[PDB]
DNA sequence: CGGCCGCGCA
DNA sequence: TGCGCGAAGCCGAT
C-alpha cells in the first residue's frame, strides 16, 4: 500500500549504517500516517530500526496555554502508543535547524524522513538541516489525500478549477492504510510545567482574574479524535447539509483541532464518511470541505509564499481595496478593543467570546468576524494583521494553511470573485448583521456567549 | 463564452 | 427556511 508519488527526495547522499529517523512535525499520530509507514518500510528493507524525533521550539510563547497543553497531552499519549510498537521517541528542545542536524550526527542516522507542510518556517528549517547533513532526506505528504505537488503544479484561482483535478485522482490516491509493523531490530511533564509557567503572565483572564479558557469542550489526543469522528458520523452528519451554517446548532464535525495537529488523518475521515449511509447532500457538502477546501489551502500556501500578506490577493482585489484606502470607516477599533469584544456590534462581540472561551469559533461566524475586522480597521494591512493575530493566538486549530486561506478569502477575495461595490471594502463580498438575522437565531447565539 | 452574498417571494 | 435573481470579473477549456 505504498504509492511512490507520496514521497520525494529533498536531498541525495550516501545512505548510512544506522536507524531511519522520522522527524515528525505536522502529523502527531501513530496510526494512518504515511510518513511513519514509509520510514518503517525503508527501515525494513535496510534491516535497521525506525525511531521518531520531535523538536519542541520556543514558538509556543507566541500562542497560549490552550494550544501548548492540547499539543503536549497528545504527545504524552503518542509516546505510549509508539512504545507498544517498540518504536522509541526522542523529544528535543530548541531550533530544529541546529537540533535535527546534531541528532542525525550524534545518533548515526542512515536516512532522514519528514512529513509535509507548506508554511515558510518549515522550509527554512529543511534548508538548514540539508546544509548540515550528508545522508538522504525524504519528504512524505501525510496530511493530504492527494500529495500537494501532484494535485496541481500551480496556484489555483478557484475551487472550480482545483475540484476536477483533485477528484480525477481520488480513484488512485483514496485507499486504506496498512497496519504499522512493530520494530524487530527531561520528561514531557517537566517541559509542560516549565512552559505553562513561562506563559502564565499572559493568560486570558476575566475581570475577576479567573481564566477565560474552558478546556472541557475538546479532549486532546488520537483516541479522543477518533471518538469525535465516530460521533460526527452517528449524530451530526445527517443534518450537516442543512445546518452547517447555523452557529446556534452543534452540527459541525468538531475535528479541526485534531486535524490541525495531525492527531487524526483526513484520509481516514474521508474513508469512513464515504462508507457511511447518510443524507447524500450532507456527505457531498462535508467531503467537499475536507477534500477541496482543505487541500486547496495547502495549494495556496505552497505556491504563494506571501500567503499571509496583501501581496497574495488577486489583482482585482488589490486594485479595489487600494482605491478605497481614503474612505472614512464607520468605526475604527484597535487590536485590544477587538480582542476584548468591545465593539458596537453584539454579534461580532459574541463571536469573539466564543473564540476566547472555547478556542473554536463556528465556521460561519469566522467569515463574518474577519469581514468586520476589514470594515472597522484603519487599513487593509492592519485588518489582515489583526485577524491573523487573534486567529493564531486563540484558535486551537490556528497557525494553519486553512487559517491563512480562510482569512485571505474573507479579507482579500482569494478563491472568490468581485461581488458588489461599497465604501471601504470595495468589491470584497459583504456580509451583514441583518443577513445573519434572516438565516439563524442571532439572539440565541449572542445570549449563549454573553 | 461557461460557470462559479442580500433581497424579494413562496 | 428554501430557491432564484441581481449585478457581475476572470480564468481556462475551445
Ligand atoms: C476567517 C477564517 C479563518 C479560519 N481559520 C481557520 C484555522 O485557523 N484553522 C482551520 O483549520 N480552519 C480555519 N478556517 C476554516 C474553517 O472555518 C474551519 O476549518 C472549521 O470551522 C473547523 O470546524 P470543523 O472541523 O468542525 O468544520 P467542518 O465543517 O466539520 O469541516 C471539516 C473539515 O473541513 C475543512 N474545512 C472546512 N471549512 C474550510 C474552509 N473554509 N477552508 C479550508 N478548510 C475547511 C477543515 O479541515 C475542517 O476541519 C477559517 C475560516 C475563515 C473564514
Q: Which molecules are bound in this entry?
A: flavin-adenine dinucleotide
Using the coordinates above, name the CATH class of the largest domain. Mainly Alpha
Helix/strand order, N-terminal first: EEHEHEHEHEHHHHHHHHHHHHHHHH
What proportion strand? 5-15%
In total, the number of strands is 6
Write down the Rg: 22 Å
Q: How many DSSP helices?
A: 20
Pfam families: DNA_photolyase
Catalytic activity: cyclobutadipyrimidine (in DNA) = 2 pyrimidine residues (in DNA)
Protein name: Deoxyribodipyrimidine photo-lyase
GO molecular function, one term: nucleotide binding
In short:
By secondary structure, the chain is an alpha/beta fold. The chain is 50% helix and 7% strand.
Any overview of this molecule?
It is classed as lyase/dna. Keywords: lyase-DNA complex, photolyase, DNA damage, DNA repair, class II, intact CPD-lesion, protein-DNA complex, water cluster. With 450 residues, the chain is α/β, with parallel strands linked by helices. The chain has three domains: 1-142, Rossmann fold (3-Layer(aba) Sandwich), CATH 3.40.50.620; 143-309, Serine Threonine Protein Phosphatase 5, Tetratricopeptide repeat (Alpha Horseshoe), CATH 1.25.40.80; 310-450, DNA Cyclobutane Dipyrimidine Photolyase, subunit A, domain 3 (Orthogonal Bundle). Helix content is 50%, strand content 7%. The chain is built from 20 helices and six strands. The protein has helices at 34-45, 65-84, 96-106, 120-131, 148-151, 159-168, 170-173, 188-199, 222-243, 256-261, 266-275, 280-303, 315-323, 335-339, 346-358, 363-375, 380-394, 401-412, 433-437, 442-448, and strands spanning 7-11, 20-23, 50-56, 89-93, 111-115, 137-140. The protein has a six-stranded mixed beta sheet. Strand 2, helix 1 (34-45) and strand 3 (50-56) form a beta-alpha-beta unit. Helix 3 packs parallel to helix 4 (120-131), helix 12 (280-303) packs across helix 18 and helix 15 packs across helix 20. The longest helix is centred in the middle third of the chain and has 24 residues, at 280-303. The site of flavin-adenine dinucleotide (FAD) has 28 residues, from helix 10, helix 12, helix 16 and helix 18. Residues 244, 252-256, 259-260, 289-290, 293-294, 297, 363, 366-367, 370, 391, 395, 397-398, 400, 402-403, 405-407, 410 line the site of flavin-adenine dinucleotide. The structure holds a DNA duplex (10 and 14 nucleotides).
